[PDB]
Amino acid sequence: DNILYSGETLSTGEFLNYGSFVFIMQEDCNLVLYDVDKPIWATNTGGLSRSCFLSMQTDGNLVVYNPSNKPIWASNTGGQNGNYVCILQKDRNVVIYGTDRWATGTHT
Amino acid sequence: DNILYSGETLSTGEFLNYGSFVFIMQEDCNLVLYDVDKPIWATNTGGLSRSCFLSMQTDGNLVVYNPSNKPIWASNTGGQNGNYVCILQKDRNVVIYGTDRWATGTHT
Amino acid sequence: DNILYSGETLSTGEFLNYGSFVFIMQEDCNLVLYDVDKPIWATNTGGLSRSCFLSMQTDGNLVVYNPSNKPIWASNTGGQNGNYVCILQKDRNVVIYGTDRWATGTHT
Amino acid sequence: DNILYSGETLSTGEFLNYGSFVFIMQEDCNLVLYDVDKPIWATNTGGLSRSCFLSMQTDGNLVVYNPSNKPIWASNTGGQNGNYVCILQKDRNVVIYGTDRWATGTHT
Ligand SMILES: OC[C@H]1O[C@H](OC[C@H]2O[C@H](O)[C@@H](O)[C@@H](O[C@H]3O[C@H](CO)[C@@H](O)[C@H](O)[C@@H]3O)[C@@H]2O)[C@@H](O)[C@@H](O)[C@@H]1O
Ligand SMILES: OC[C@H]1O[C@H](OC[C@H]2O[C@H](O)[C@@H](O)[C@@H](O[C@H]3O[C@H](CO)[C@@H](O)[C@H](O)[C@@H]3O)[C@@H]2O)[C@@H](O)[C@@H](O)[C@@H]1O
Ligand SMILES: OC[C@H]1O[C@H](OC[C@H]2O[C@H](O)[C@@H](O)[C@@H](O[C@H]3O[C@H](CO)[C@@H](O)[C@H](O)[C@@H]3O)[C@@H]2O)[C@@H](O)[C@@H](O)[C@@H]1O
Ligand SMILES: OC[C@H]1O[C@H](OC[C@H]2O[C@H](O)[C@@H](O)[C@@H](O[C@H]3O[C@H](CO)[C@@H](O)[C@H](O)[C@@H]3O)[C@@H]2O)[C@@H](O)[C@@H](O)[C@@H]1O
Ligand SMILES: OC[C@H]1O[C@H](OC[C@H]2O[C@H](O)[C@@H](O)[C@@H](O[C@H]3O[C@H](CO)[C@@H](O)[C@H](O)[C@@H]3O)[C@@H]2O)[C@@H](O)[C@@H](O)[C@@H]1O
Ligand SMILES: OC[C@H]1O[C@H](OC[C@H]2O[C@H](O)[C@@H](O)[C@@H](O[C@H]3O[C@H](CO)[C@@H](O)[C@H](O)[C@@H]3O)[C@@H]2O)[C@@H](O)[C@@H](O)[C@@H]1O
Ligand SMILES: OC[C@H]1O[C@H](OC[C@H]2O[C@H](O)[C@@H](O)[C@@H](O[C@H]3O[C@H](CO)[C@@H](O)[C@H](O)[C@@H]3O)[C@@H]2O)[C@@H](O)[C@@H](O)[C@@H]1O
Ligand SMILES: OC[C@H]1O[C@H](OC[C@H]2O[C@H](O)[C@@H](O)[C@@H](O[C@H]3O[C@H](CO)[C@@H](O)[C@H](O)[C@@H]3O)[C@@H]2O)[C@@H](O)[C@@H](O)[C@@H]1O
Ligand SMILES: OC[C@H]1O[C@H](OC[C@H]2O[C@H](O)[C@@H](O)[C@@H](O)[C@@H]2O)[C@@H](O)[C@@H](O)[C@@H]1O
Ligand SMILES: OC[C@H]1O[C@H](OC[C@H]2O[C@H](O)[C@@H](O)[C@@H](O)[C@@H]2O)[C@@H](O)[C@@H](O)[C@@H]1O
Ligand SMILES: OC[C@H]1O[C@H](OC[C@H]2O[C@H](O)[C@@H](O)[C@@H](O)[C@@H]2O)[C@@H](O)[C@@H](O)[C@@H]1O
Ligand SMILES: OC[C@H]1O[C@H](OC[C@H]2O[C@H](O)[C@@H](O)[C@@H](O)[C@@H]2O)[C@@H](O)[C@@H](O)[C@@H]1O
Fold it and tell me: What residues bind alpha-D-mannopyranose, as annotated (chains A, B, C, D)?
């Protein structure tokens, strides 16, 4: 999938993907955007811990947590509580949008 | 694709899709969300014109336009100018989120 | 997903999808190919049973089974035992190909 | 897309993708299967030419050609003329299946 919704987490080894782009939460705690095999962007936090998870929070903050729940890296975009999405876009940009402004209200 | 970015248009017959969900801009100008063959939601504007297109504007407004560029239906969420996305989500909700709060800045 | 591999089954309500095309195993036991809301092809076996499942067998036969495991419809392409795939193609054709002729051998 | 149909070609830089798997026809003429950034399989023909293209032929043969149309590598599965598909499967195997055994005949 190419979208991480607020309230969701990407566990170790999990990722967002689109075409040849992979945004992965690595086991060495480095969050990396790859274009095939080339690292395009990273949090540069590899080695600081093991088995981190990525959380797209309801306050709009994207945070990498270690098992002890200490924040290793954050987008520092926390703020208003609502619904947000982190998207790995077709143009290779990873963007956080929010909050929701309109909906059809057809959610199950 | 399941995302319509601001600055984009879905021409007549074009759509957003995810699994069995299809959000289509029909030729009879009705914008309909289908779950397989069942209409789940619609703007109920079929017959009011022919060959309409759907525009996700930079002001956050989702508008259905007829060829003469007159708005047939709108979400009425127009406002701040920026970047927005209209997503046909995995939970079957069609939602508009915006503006962008953070990005890796890796866009080509 | 747009591929049903041999050894797999699509339970009631499950489907293959690609763009606006949905090949679904309905609860009324009718196997239907939809292009948005229009039925393009069907086995025309709706009502003959309830809760059927679709099986892409290892003998290359695509069979619709009722709960009592009696074949309601079949492609009648059963034959050589091997690996087959039933694909809902981008050109809107649903095709069974097989057997395998070559592989990288990189399966987990 | 995760399927290369017979009669199609993947030009230089083009690829098949599924999840974190990328089967790419590189500009250095090496055909490589990547699992994120790790090479899982390759034809090991990098440097033998520039700007090769991958062809899934109607005779069931998968061939890497250089601009001068000389075969750099082949699966050597050429044979019966018909319809074939090369699939980058969900189980990380890249497999060629063919020929077609059955179809709904709903192709546009
Ligand atoms: O250009 C962005 C960024 O790229 C490089 O950082 C990304 C790499 O950071 C670390 O070196 C690792 O996390 C590495 O990950 C690979 O190696 C790991 C250790 O062998 C392995 O566990 C992983 O599976 C993966 O293969 C990242 O690829 C670096 O150039 C940065 O300076 C730069 O900002
Ligand atoms: O915020 C007040 C509201 O909170 C609690 O309900 C939360 C749900 O409210 C609605 O049903 C939806 O907004 C639902 O979320 C869906 O729609 C969103 C956009 O409309 C979208 O962003 C989500 O992804 C999802 O599809 C909320 O989850 C509850 O306490 C209510 O009583 C209260 O009024
Ligand atoms: O429950 C939501 C909504 O569903 C129904 O409206 C959707 C239908 O609206 C019109 O009837 C048409 O636009 C129809 O579209 C189909 O028929 C067209 C005309 O034959 C055809 O051109 C299209 O390709 C399509 O097959 C929509 O499906 C209705 O029950 C609403 O009351 C209700 O709000
Ligand atoms: O707004 C001021 C800015 O406007 C003009 O540039 C617009 C581009 O600015 C950045 O490069 C990006 O924001 C780019 O959009 C990409 O990133 C967004 C999030 O960062 C994302 O929502 C988009 O989808 C896209 O990936 C903008 O397009 C120009 O006049 C600048 O000089 C000026 O500073
Ligand atoms: O052109 C192909 C084929 O189309 C038509 O058959 C498909 C329909 O067959 C039955 O009528 C039903 O299975 C129907 O399914 C819909 O209705 C069901 C009952 O209301 C419902 O449970 C399903 O969810 C679905 O909405 C199929 O759509 C028919 O014209 C054939 O002659 C023709 O061969
Ligand atoms: O047929 C003889 C063989 O059968 C049993 O092994 C079956 C597996 O054999 C290989 O490992 C693979 O073929 C594997 O299937 C993978 O590759 C196929 C193409 O190579 C592909 O179609 C499949 O989808 C899958 O990716 C088979 O599952 C076993 O009894 C062996 O001892 C015996 O030699
Ligand atoms: O385990 C499979 C296979 O892996 C390795 O071969 C794959 C690599 O082969 C060559 O080294 C290159 O084609 C390389 O491609 C990368 O480097 C290129 C040159 O810098 C660059 O142009 C490409 O974009 C790409 O980044 C492949 O990755 C090797 O270990 C084999 O022995 C082994 O069989
Ligand atoms: O082989 C004899 C036949 O060849 C020429 O027609 C080729 C087309 O024939 C059918 O229309 C289809 O098979 C079509 O291919 C579609 O269906 C295939 C399975 O049925 C599938 O594999 C393909 O991907 C495609 O969807 C062929 O392309 C022509 O000379 C005919 O006159 C002649 O009888
Ligand atoms: O080290 C990374 C950042 O860690 C902290 O920010 C994370 C926290 O921010 C907000 O308090 C909430 O969103 C919390 O849920 C979240 O954990 C700060 O120290 C920040 O400055 C760091 O950049
Ligand atoms: O008939 C549908 C709506 O049409 C108009 O709104 C559309 C316009 O809204 C803003 O002015 C901008 O976003 C424009 O680009 C857009 O066309 C209004 O009449 C509204 O009340 C209607 O609901
Ligand atoms: O009624 C549909 C078809 O049912 C039977 O064929 C299904 C069986 O075919 C082969 O025997 C095997 O592949 C079995 O696994 C499969 O169930 C036949 O009666 C056929 O004539 C019908 O068309
Ligand atoms: O060097 C790779 C292979 O090249 C040749 O095979 C490719 C040719 O095979 C069949 O003749 C047809 O499918 C042709 O279209 C195709 O180009 C052979 O030399 C083979 O032995 C090599 O392995």
Answer: 26, 28, 30, 34, 37-38, 41-42, 44, 57, 59, 61, 65, 72-73, 76, 83, 89, 91, 93, 97, 102
Q: Are A26 and A39 in contact (CB under 8 A)?
A: no
Domain of A18: which CATH number?
A: 2.90.10.10
Please tell me the distance from the alpha carbon of residue A86 to that of residue A22, in angstroms, as a whole number. Answer: 13
CA B36, B38, B43, B44 torsion-angle sign? positive
Q: Is the peptide bond before D12 cis (omega within 30 degrees of 0)?
A: no
How many domains does chain A divide into?
1
Q: How far apart are CA C4 and CA D90, in angstroms?
A: 11
How many residues are listed for chain B in this entry?
A: 108
Is residue C48 within 8 Å of residue C72, measured between CB atoms? yes
Strands, E, within chain D: which ranges? Answer: 3-5, 8-10, 15-18, 21-25, 31-35, 38-42, 53-56, 62-65, 71-74, 84-88, 94-98, 100-103
- Domain of residue B53, residue span: 1-108
B99 to chain A: which residues are within 8 Å by CB? 97
Structure determination method = X-ray
Task: Give the Cβ contact number of residue A101 at 10 Å.
Answer: 22
Rounded CA-CA distance B38/B22 in Å is 10
CA atoms of C88 and C66, how far apart (whole Å): 23
- C11 at B interface, C-beta within 8 A: no
For chain C positions 25-84, those within 8 Å of chain B (CB to CB) are 34, 36-39
The CB of B83 under 6 Å from ligand 4? The reply is: yes
Residue in B8, B62, B95 to test binding to A, most A beta-carbons within 10 Å: B95
Are A and C touching by the rule of 3+ CB pairs within 8 Å?
no
d(CA B83, CA B97): 9
Whole-number Å distance between alpha carbons of A8 and B39: 29
